[PDB]
Amino acid sequence: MHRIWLMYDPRRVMVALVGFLAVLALVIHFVLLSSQRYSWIENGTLGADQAPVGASAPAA
Amino acid sequence: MHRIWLMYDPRRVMVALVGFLAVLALVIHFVLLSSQRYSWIENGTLGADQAPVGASAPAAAAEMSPLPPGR
Amino acid sequence: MHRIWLMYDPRRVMVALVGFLAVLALVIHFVLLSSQRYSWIENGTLGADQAPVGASAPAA
Amino acid sequence: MHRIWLMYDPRRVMVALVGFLAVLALVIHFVLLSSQRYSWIENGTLGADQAPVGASAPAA
Amino acid sequence: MHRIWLMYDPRRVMVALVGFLAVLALVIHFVLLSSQRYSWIENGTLGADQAPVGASAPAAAAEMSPLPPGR
Amino acid sequence: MHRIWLMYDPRRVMVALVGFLAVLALVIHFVLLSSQRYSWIENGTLGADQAPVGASAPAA
Amino acid sequence: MHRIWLMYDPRRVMVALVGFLAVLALVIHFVLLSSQRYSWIENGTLGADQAPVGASAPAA
Amino acid sequence: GSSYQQAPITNQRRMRGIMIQSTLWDMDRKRSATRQRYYPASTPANQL
Amino acid sequence: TRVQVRTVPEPGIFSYLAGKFGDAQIGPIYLGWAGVLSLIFGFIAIEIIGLNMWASVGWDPVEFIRQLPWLALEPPPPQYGLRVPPLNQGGWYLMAGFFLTVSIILWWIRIYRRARALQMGSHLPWAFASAIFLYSTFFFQPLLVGSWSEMVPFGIFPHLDWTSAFSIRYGNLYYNPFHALSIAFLYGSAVLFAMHGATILAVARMGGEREIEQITDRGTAAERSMLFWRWCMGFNATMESIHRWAWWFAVLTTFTGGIGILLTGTVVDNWYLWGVKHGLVAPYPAQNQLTPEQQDLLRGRYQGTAPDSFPSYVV
Amino acid sequence: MMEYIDGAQIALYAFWLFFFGLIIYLRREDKREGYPLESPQGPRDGWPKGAPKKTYVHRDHG
Amino acid sequence: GMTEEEARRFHGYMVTGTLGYVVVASVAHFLAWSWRPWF
Amino acid sequence: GMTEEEARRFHGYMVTGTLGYVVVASVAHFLAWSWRPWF
Amino acid sequence: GGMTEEEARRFHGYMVTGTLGYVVVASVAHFLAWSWRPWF
Amino acid sequence: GMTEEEARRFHGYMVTGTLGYVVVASVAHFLAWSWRPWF
Amino acid sequence: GMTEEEARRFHGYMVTGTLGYVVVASVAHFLAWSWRPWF
Amino acid sequence: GMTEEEARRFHGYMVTGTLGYVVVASVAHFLAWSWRPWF
Amino acid sequence: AMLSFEKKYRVRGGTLIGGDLFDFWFGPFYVGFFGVTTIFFVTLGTLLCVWGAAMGPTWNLWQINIAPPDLKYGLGLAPLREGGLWQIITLCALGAFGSWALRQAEIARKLGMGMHIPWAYGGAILAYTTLVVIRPFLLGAWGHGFPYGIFSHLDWVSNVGYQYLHFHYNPAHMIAVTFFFTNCLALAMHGSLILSVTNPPKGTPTGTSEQENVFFRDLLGYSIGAIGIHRLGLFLAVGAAVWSAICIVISGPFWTQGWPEWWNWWLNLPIWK
Ligand SMILES: CCCCCCCCCCCCCC(=O)OC[C@H](COP(=O)(O)OCC(O)COP(=O)(O)OC[C@@H](COC(=O)CCCCCCCCCCCCC)OC(=O)CCCCCCCCCCCCC)OC(=O)CCCCCCCCCCCCC
Ligand SMILES: CCCCCCCCCCCCCC(=O)OC[C@H](COP(=O)(O)OCC(O)COP(=O)(O)OC[C@@H](COC(=O)CCCCCCCCCCCCC)OC(=O)CCCCCCCCCCCCC)OC(=O)CCCCCCCCCCCCC
Ligand code: BCL
Ligand code: BCL
Ligand SMILES: CC[C@H]1c2cc3[nH]c4c(c3C)C(=O)[C@H](C(=O)OC)c4c3nc(cc4[nH]c(cc(n2)[C@@H]1C)c(C(C)=O)c4C)[C@@H](C)[C@@H]3CCC(=O)OC/C=C(\C)CCC[C@H](C)CCC[C@H](C)CCCC(C)C
Ligand SMILES: COC(C)(C)C/C=C/C(C)=C/C=C/C(C=O)=C/C=C/C(C)=C/C=C/C=C(C)/C=C/C=C(\C)CC/C=C(C)/C=C/C=C(\C)C(=O)O
Ligand SMILES: COC(C)(C)C/C=C/C(C)=C/C=C/C(C=O)=C/C=C/C(C)=C/C=C/C=C(C)/C=C/C=C(\C)CC/C=C(C)/C=C/C=C(\C)C(=O)O
Ligand SMILES: COC(C)(C)C/C=C/C(C)=C/C=C/C(C)=C/C=C/C(C)=C/C=C\C=C(C)\C=C\C=C(C)\C=C\C=C(C)\C=C\CC(C)(C)OC
Ligand SMILES: CCCCCCCCCCCCO[C@@H]1O[C@H](CO)[C@@H](O[C@H]2O[C@H](CO)[C@@H](O)[C@H](O)[C@H]2O)[C@H](O)[C@H]1O
Ligand SMILES: CCCCCCCCCCCCO[C@@H]1O[C@H](CO)[C@@H](O[C@H]2O[C@H](CO)[C@@H](O)[C@H](O)[C@H]2O)[C@H](O)[C@H]1O
Ligand SMILES: CCCCCCCCCCCCO[C@@H]1O[C@H](CO)[C@@H](O[C@H]2O[C@H](CO)[C@@H](O)[C@H](O)[C@H]2O)[C@H](O)[C@H]1O
Ligand SMILES: CCCCCCCCCCCCO[C@@H]1O[C@H](CO)[C@@H](O[C@H]2O[C@H](CO)[C@@H](O)[C@H](O)[C@H]2O)[C@H](O)[C@H]1O
Ligand SMILES: [Fe+3]
């Protein structure tokens, strides 16, 4: 499978890879930080049972 | 692994790295500073037990009818 | 470590460093000046036991 | 230590220094003049025992 | 010290110097003219013990009002 | 001192001077005219003891 | 004194002078016409002691 | 009004912009920014 | 494209000439004495504005960036009229306005002197003078109505708050005919530069962008430009005179604008009612009808002073 | 006094007279090239009559 | 340019015009003063 | 530019004209101070 | 030009050592931060 | 540009003008102090 | 273009100036700490 | 650019002028502190 | 009548549809097939405008007002007196404006010019089509179009702005305004530079490209070049209309709150929330 590095230049791809991973990681952390459930800077010391949960269906 | 520095200019990668680390360090400090638990310039002298903590699930019916604050 | 100055022109490095340090120091002073606890121009004489402290946990 | 002036043109360093110090002096005077404790044009004749302090009066 | 005029063209320096002194003097006169204690055009005839002291409050006047009567 | 006219063309200096004095005189007249005490067009016929005076020290 | 006319083109000086005097005269007439005391088109026939006078000092 | 009485300094806005209460403060409720809206208390040193 | 030339010795006889075109020095970006003073005066104006904005968030540098477009240096209170106001209540405003105004006028002189030194016509400083004229009506109209409170606050969103409130106070600026004319020239300036830019790019293959040559020695690129517009809309300019159409449409934008501002609050206080008087206002069916008791009940008060007390209502 | 006449109406008609004067000026400038027109009935100037052809002098390097 | 003899000639009219203008203004001011003094 | 003796000549007029104008302004302030003093 | 392989080894040796030294002081910074105010 | 002895000459006037200006400013401040002190 | 000799020489000052800066900042922090601790 | 001794001469003025300015500012703070201490 | 150099250029060819059938002139005007369709749509649309004026309350030019239908009619064609007449005129306007752009393309092709002018005019047609077609369609009623009346459409602009409480806060509107203002400055600047080299002060040689390049560099701190200033003017003028189209199409179809509270995202960036 290393023949793929005869098609694509490692110089171009490794920059594009690091860029994509850095952007994806940062997007996920800020999505979680904005949530109630995972606002870990304020609430990280709460136990799992104490952490927020979104509203269930009432079904009635 | 050292051959990565044949693949990229060792002079320029250093500037890119320090620039990245400086921005990340500043971002994390300002995220913390704007928080309540880690607004350390105002509340850094508080002990860990008395530092702020974010809101918690009521762990109950969330329904028990209130009573007024005592006059 | 002095060979590092062969790789980077100190004419460039020191201008960048002095610029960074000056901006950073100004940011830190103004962050302190606008806080309650360290607004030293108005309250610098108070003495540590009666300087402000940010509110302890709401659960108190 | 003087070889810094072989590395930089002193004709530019002096202009940068003079401009930096002039702006810094203006900023500090403006910050103080905007304060209550050091509003010296209005209150400079007050003795230090009755100059303002950034604290609330006891027992209201 | 005279060699400063060999490093800097005095023809350029004097324009900047005059400009700096002009803005500085104008800033200080406008600052004083807007002060309570030193608004000398309105109150310059007051004696030193009659002149305002301590009038540093940021909103000494009403912010919101009609314009003064037109005639 | 006459050698100043070798650095600066007196033809140019004289026009700039006349312009500066015109603007300065206009500013000073306009500042006085919009004052209370020296609004001489409406109130110039008042005697010196009848002319307005700014407020004394408050809270005596 | 006449040599000022060698330093400056009299064509440009006279245009400059006429322009200045025209603007200045127009400004002064409008300032007076806007005033209360000297709004001569409406009140020019009033006697001097019946013409408006601005507010005096607050003696009472 | 006949005459003007100054509010306590803690009731005086730092921001003189007239619409700020609708354009910004309706939506902004950050604690630090909310504190900066008014001047802090200020007392002659002998009264402390 | 993508065969750039690069010139090592000085073009003008990448790089640039150090030399003279007669009185005009070439090389550095020209300031002269008027340019230097303009930058000094203008810098102090910018500093006063920014320091006042930054002080208004209590020197907090995070809030200074976060809130920046809402920050203002705000004009004096209305009851001062034209008198000098307290430093914290518009004294800094008038000081920044003064230094900005001087800085602008010194920049005009700098441009005027440079045009003459390069042996060029005076068209650019008189175009800039039209913009300065509109700017100055934000001083003269507050002067004519008699209060510095009516001036424009320094601030990104705050000056837009003023722009809306000015139209509200004076009863809808759409019915000001000089505002309407100013818009016609503003739109016309976009029409002309779209048409002209597209025209010259459409003949650039034939050397049409060398406009000075096409003015002095009419080529086929000029002829095709003239025939396109003649065949399209029945009349045409020339390679020179299209720049006169351009110049006047830009200049008339701010000139007619300035007249519209000077008339507002001095001659007309409600432009919609002026529109009714002069027949501008289209009729619509009534959305409501008041009874005579409601005409007295629903009149309000003109807005007064803010309450300077905190009433208790002890009852 | 004059009810219907007011200063904003006076100013606006002053602008209209200026503006039509300017359009006439610009149309004269527009005719410094390509005019008089050819026609089957002979030469034509349209209206306003154009300004004349304009001769340019160039900076002497001799 | 101009000759110094022309400048001397021109200056005489320029001074005479300035004086005549100042005279007419001085009468205009004294007329205005008599009708409605400003001090 | 100017010769030094031409600069010398101009400087005499320039100093005298400045000091003359300052003298006239001094008298205008004497008149203003008599009419309505500012201290 | 480019980097010669003996220079690249010298540069890599510094670069890796510097990176790890930075991580070490950041480790102590987190040790101090955690013992002052833990986030879990 | 300018020669050293020519710079020496100019410097003497700059020193003299600066001193004269600071002297006038010192009298202006002491007049202002005697009228209405700021400390 | 640095020589290795100049680079060695410059580095000695850069280390020294950094150490001086860190020392002053260390005294400044301990003054600040003893006046108003942040932990 | 500069020669090495020409830089050495400039450095003498530059250092001494800096330390002179710091000395004047030190007295300014001594006077400000005596008038209204900030700690 | 013809310009003194014109006859040489009046060849056949470059048409898009009609071949040689309409490939002729009428006075100065080129006709062509889209000339014929232009005049058809112009005449029909204008006479229906005059009819809308006739059945309206007045002939006063400023007060004439052909309004769109009520929103209850949705995307149907309303009764003609109830706003269906506005809908017919709108179709005529689109036919005229489209025909005008295609006629310009035939003229440019006949002269060997690039298509820059038709495409630039397309920026104006886009903005019109956004106001009367695209935004009304996304809102679901033709009644969202603006009325045809010299001042009554300014009443529409006024009320649409205040539907969002403070329309100055619309971020695309801020960009569009900046393009309009920058365009007008750039037009004053370019117009002045060409005129001042071609009309130097009396008794001075005619200027050169080098002089306007020198002066422009003193004004902006860079040299744009002769083609660059025309690219800039086209970019600014057309970009203004495109950002105008964006700013109105986001108001209602995509954003429905006040525009000030759109900025809440900036206040809540996590670095300073
Ligand atoms: C309400 C408005 C608000 C707003 C109020 C303010 C608006 C002010 C706008 C002024 C615009 C003037 C533009 C201009 O003059 O440009 C060319 C020239 C430089 O030209 P150059 O080419 O680079 O150099 C050569 C120069 O000499 C010009 O030569 P030129 O061939 O053109 O020939 C002569 C002059 C005409 O000159 C004179 O008239 C001088 C006469 C001197 C007489 C001395 C006394 C002799 C004894 C008396 C004898 C007896 C007989 C008299 O060419 C001109 O035509 C240009 C205009 C000259 C006039 C300058 C403006 C003066 C009037 C200002 C009026 C202010 C408003 C009333 O520029 C200058 O020298 C500077 C102009 C003045 C700027 C002053 C500084 C700005 C204010 C700063 C305020 C600072 C804070 C207070
Ligand atoms: C005049 C004395 C008083 C003066 C004071 C008041 C008015 C001041 C302005 C005076 C301007 C000149 C009027 C004139 O007579 O022009 C003759 C000339 C025709 O070209 P030419 O080179 O001069 O002559 C050649 C021709 O004689 C012989 O060749 P040929 O025999 O092949 O030509 C056929 C002829 C037939 O002649 C006509 O049909 C004349 C038509 C004039 C129509 C004017 C209508 C104005 C009212 C519209 C009210 C609205 C009706 C819907 O020529 C033609 O085929 C005509 C070609 C021109 C087509 C013009 C199209 C409309 C132009 C814009 C209309 C205004 C839009 C607001 O036509 C033109 O150049 C007209 C266009 C020039 C002015 C455009 C100005 C646009 C300003 C827009 C900004 C407005 C901001 C508020
Ligand atoms: C609710 C809001 C109101 C309204 C209120 C106003 C007001 C109020 C004004 C305008 C004005 C204008 N309006 Mg309107 N306007 C509305 C609706 C519109 C609509 C529309 C589609 O609805 C449009 C297209 C316009 C268009 C226009 C322009 C034609 C005109 C400005 C011309 C110009 O170039 O100004 C831009 C140019 C300038 C401001 C000149 C600046 C020149 C100076 C010299 C630049 C100095 C720069 C300086 C050195 C830089 C440093 C500064 C520091 C950072 C501080 N308005 C509605 C009805 N409008 C103006 C006008 O002329 O009114 C008659 C005006 O004052
Ligand atoms: C070129 C020299 C080598 C090196 C050679 C050695 C040698 C030899 C020894 C250690 C030892 C240690 N090294 Mg090591 N070490 C290096 C780089 C590192 C780095 C790093 C970020 O790169 C780190 C975190 C460490 C950390 C450590 C500790 C885990 C360990 C215990 C001593 C100590 O506290 O040192 C504190 C110092 C630091 C955290 C940073 C500075 C490291 C200095 C340059 C290492 C040499 C000094 C040595 C420790 C002095 C005492 C031993 C002598 C033989 C007398 N070394 C470099 C690459 N290291 C010792 C060990 O394993 O003991 C059981 C040991 O004997
Ligand atoms: C015809 C009408 C249009 C118009 C035209 C127009 N504007 C013009 C011109 C023209 C023809 C110019 O020639 C002139 C110009 O210079 O253009 C580049 C200008 C101009 N139009 C401007 C802006 C402008 N024009 C606008 C509008 C308009 N301009 C109209 C649409 C607007 C709007 C829409 O609001 C704005 C904001 C400016 C870019 C410019 C005038 C610049 C000026 O006056 O600057 C004065 C100086 C300052 C602001 C100070 C700057 C301070 C520095 C940033 C400090 C840096 C430190 C400094 C070095 C310290 C000092 C040390 C000393 C030793 C040097
Ligand atoms: C908000 O805070 C607020 C309230 C604002 C408070 C804060 C205020 C602050 C920060 C103030 C700062 C002040 C300051 C520095 O920073 C102040 C520094 C001021 C200085 C340096 C003043 C210097 C003046 C010098 C002058 C006048 C010189 C004149 C020279 C003359 C006349 C001679 C010219 C030469 C001739 C004639 C010879 C020609 C010969 C030739 C050619 C030959 O011989 O060839
Ligand atoms: C919200 O968060 C908030 C609150 C903001 C929290 C903050 C958070 C953060 C992220 C802080 C970051 C801090 C930081 C890094 O990251 C900080 C890094 C600081 C650093 C590196 C400081 C270094 C200073 C070094 C100096 C001064 C050196 C001076 C050297 C001199 C004088 C000698 C010059 C040379 C000479 C004389 C010889 C010439 C000879 C020559 C030429 C020859 O011989 O040739
Ligand atoms: C430390 O340095 C810092 C960091 C502070 C520097 C940074 C500064 C920053 C960030 C500055 C930001 C500035 C901004 C964002 C400014 C925005 C300005 C805007 C949008 C302004 C818009 C319009 C303003 C107008 C039209 C103002 C007009 C004012 C006039 C015409 C005033 C004239 C006053 C005169 C002529 C005279 C006054 C004095 C008199 C004669 C009356 O005497 C008292
Ligand atoms: C070239 C230089 C030209 C300008 C030189 C100006 C020099 C000015 C020197 C100012 C010296 C002040 O000298 C004197 O200081 C003492 C404290 O030491 C002040 O002392 C007084 O005020 C202070 C502060 O309010 C109180 O704390 C103190 O209890 C009280 O006695 C005096 O009010 C002042 O008169
Ligand atoms: C500027 C002068 C115009 C009057 C200004 C107001 C001041 C009133 C007093 C004027 C008295 C006479 O003033 C005096 O005039 C003479 C010429 O006559 C000038 O004389 C000047 O030019 C002459 C040549 O013409 C030189 O030889 C001389 O060295 C030089 O000073 C003086 O500089 C001035 O001091
Ligand atoms: C403020 C810091 C406080 C926390 C402590 C930080 C500890 C930092 C550890 C630094 C250890 C340096 O230890 C070691 O140095 C040598 C040179 O001396 C470097 O050696 C490097 O250059 C040499 C040549 O000189 C090459 O042969 C070698 O391959 C290369 O790695 C190593 O890369 C580094 O591992
Ligand atoms: C208000 C009082 C407090 C502020 C004082 C401000 C001025 C400085 C006071 C000390 C003055 C003497 O200071 C001294 O001047 C001499 C020249 O005379 C400088 O000397 C410098 O130039 C000379 C040649 O001129 C070189 O040979 C020398 O190597 C170089 O250092 C010294 O570097 C400086 O230290
Ligand atoms: Fe062009």
Residue K21 annotated as binding site: yes
State the pairing for strand pair I24-26/Q29-30.
unpaired
Pick left, alpha or beta for residue I32 (phi over 0 → left; psi -120 to 50 → alpha; otherwise beta): left
Give Cβ neighbours of residue I219 (< 8 Å, ≥ 6 apart). I206, I207, I208, I213
Which residue from B minimizes the CA distance to C9? B11
Residue I20, helix vs strand vs coil = strand
Cis peptide before L37 (omega within 30 of 0): no
Q: K and H: touch, per 3+ CB pairs < 8 A? A: no
Ligand 11 within 6 A of CB of M12: no
What is the whole-number distance in angstroms between the Cα of residue B22 and the centre of ligand 4?
27
Chain B interface mutation, best of Q267, Q269, Q271, highest count of B Cβ atoms under 10 Å: Q271
Report how far Cα E57 is from the mean position of its chain's Cα atoms: 19
Ligand 12 within 6 A of CB of P12: yes
Residue type, position G4, single letter: I
Helices (H), chain A: 4-7, 10-34, 40-43
DSSP-assigned letter for residue I88 = I
Residue Q17, helix vs strand vs coil = coil
DSSP-assigned letter for residue Q30 = E
Torsion, Cα of I213, I215, I218, I219 (10° steps):
50
CA G25/CA G18 separation, integer angstroms? 10
What tokens were used for G25?
């005269």
Residues of chain B positioned with their CB less than 8 A from the CB of H32: 34, 39
CA Q40/CA P17 separation, integer angstroms? 85
Pick left, alpha or beta for residue Q237 (phi over 0 → left; psi -120 to 50 → alpha; otherwise beta): alpha
DSSP codes of every residue in O13-34: HHHHHHHHHHHHHHHHHHHHHH
Size of interface B-Q (CB pairs under 8 A): 9
State the pairing for strand pair Q29-30/D52-53.
unpaired
Backbone phi and psi for residue H43, each to the nearest 5 degrees, phi listed first: -135, 140
The partner residues of Q29 in beta bridges, in order of sequence, read Q26
CA Q179/CA Q233 separation, integer angstroms? 10
What is the whole-number distance in angstroms between the Cα of residue F1 and the centre of ligand 2?
67
Cis peptide before J48 (omega within 30 of 0): yes
Q: What is the CA radius of gyration of chain G?
A: 20
CA Q111/CA Q109 separation, integer angstroms? 5
Backbone phi and psi for residue Q13, each to the nearest 5 degrees, phi listed first: 105, 170
Torsion, Cα of E1, E5, E6, E10 (10° steps):
170
The answer to whether residues Q126 and I150 touch, using CB atoms and an 8 Å cutoff, is no
The answer to whether residues F49 and F41 touch, using CB atoms and an 8 Å cutoff, is no
Residue K29 annotated as binding site: yes
Closest CB from D36, D48, D55 relative to H48: D55
CB contact under 8 A, F40 and K37: no
Which ligand is in closest contact with the Cα of J25? 2
Backbone phi and psi for residue N22, each to the nearest 5 degrees, phi listed first: -65, -35
Residues of chain F positioned with their CB less than 8 A from the CB of I84: 31, 34-35
Residue Q79, helix vs strand vs coil = coil
What is the whole-number distance in angstroms between the Cα of residue Q112 and the centre of ligand 2?
27
CB atoms within 10 A of CB I298: 9
Residue type, position J41, single letter: Q
What is the whole-number distance in angstroms between the Cα of residue I38 and the centre of ligand 8?
14
CA I122/CA I113 separation, integer angstroms? 10
What tokens were used for O15?
């280390």
Tell which residue, I24, I4, I25, has the closest CA to residue I14: I4
The answer to whether residues Q62 and Q120 touch, using CB atoms and an 8 Å cutoff, is no
CA J44/CA Q6 separation, integer angstroms? 14
C-alpha distances (whole Å) from B36 to each of B39, B42, F13, H31, M34 are 5, 10, 62, 9, 17
Which H or E run includes B4?
A: helix B4-7
State the pairing for strand pair H43-44/D52-53.
antiparallel
What tokens were used for L1?
């530019």
The answer to whether residues A43 and B33 touch, using CB atoms and an 8 Å cutoff, is no
The answer to whether residues P39 and O35 touch, using CB atoms and an 8 Å cutoff, is yes
What is the whole-number distance in angstroms between the Cα of residue I304 and the centre of ligand 2?
55
DSSP-assigned letter for residue Q268 = T
Residues of chain D positioned with their CB less than 8 A from the CB of N36: none
Burial of Q213-228, coded b for 16+ CB within 10 Å and e otherwise, reads bbbbbbbeeeebebee
Residue B5 annotated as binding site: no
Tell which residue, Q218, Q216, Q221, Q183, has the closest CA to residue Q197: Q216
Which residue from E minimizes the CA distance to N39? E53
Q: K35 at the F interface (CB within 8 A)?
A: no
The answer to whether residues Q216 and Q99 touch, using CB atoms and an 8 Å cutoff, is no
Closest CB from F16, F23, F36 relative to I83: F36
Q: How far is B57 from chain Q (nearest CA, A)?
A: 23
Residue P11 annotated as binding site: yes
Backbone phi and psi for residue F39, each to the nearest 5 degrees, phi listed first: -75, 65
State the pairing for strand pair I19-21/I24-26.
antiparallel
**Which residues line ligand 2 at a C-beta cut-off of 6 Å?**
I 184, 188, 234-235; J 20, 23-24, 27, 37, 44, 46-47; Q 1, 27-28
Residue identified by tokens 């860990």 is B48
Tell which residue, I61, D28, E50, D39, has the closest CA to residue H9: D39
Residues of chain P positioned with their CB less than 8 A from the CB of C40: 38-39
Judging by beta carbons within 10 Å of its beta carbon (0-12, 13-18, 19+), is residue E8 exposed, middle or buried?
Answer: middle
Q: Half-sphere exposure of H37 toward its Cβ, with a 13 Å CA cutoff?
A: 16
Burial of H7-44, coded b for 16+ CB within 10 Å and e otherwise, reads bebeebbbbbbbbbeebbeeebebebbebbbbbbbbbe
The partner residues of Q251 in beta bridges, in order of sequence, read Q255
Atom of ligand 8 nearest to the CA of E33: 44
Helices (H) and strands (E) in chain N, counts: 1, 0
Helices (H), Q73-113: 84-111
Chain H interface mutation, best of I56, I62, I74, I150, highest count of H Cβ atoms under 10 Å: I56
DSSP codes of every residue in L13-27: HHHHHHHHHHHHHHH
The answer to whether residues Q258 and Q163 touch, using CB atoms and an 8 Å cutoff, is no
Mark the breaks in chain A: residue after which each occurs, C to N over 2.5 Å.
none
Q: What is the CA radius of gyration of chain P?
A: 16
Report how far Cα B26 is from the mean position of its chain's Cα atoms: 11
CA H43/CA H47 separation, integer angstroms? 7
Backbone phi and psi for residue Q59, each to the nearest 5 degrees, phi listed first: -95, 0
C-alpha distances (whole Å) from Q59 to each of I285, J16, N11, Q63, Q65 are 17, 22, 81, 7, 10
Mark the breaks in chain L: residue after which each occurs, C to N over 2.5 Å.
none
The answer to whether residues A27 and A41 touch, using CB atoms and an 8 Å cutoff, is no
What tokens were used for M16?
């890796």
The percent helix, strand, coil of chain E (3-state, each to 5) is 45, 0, 55
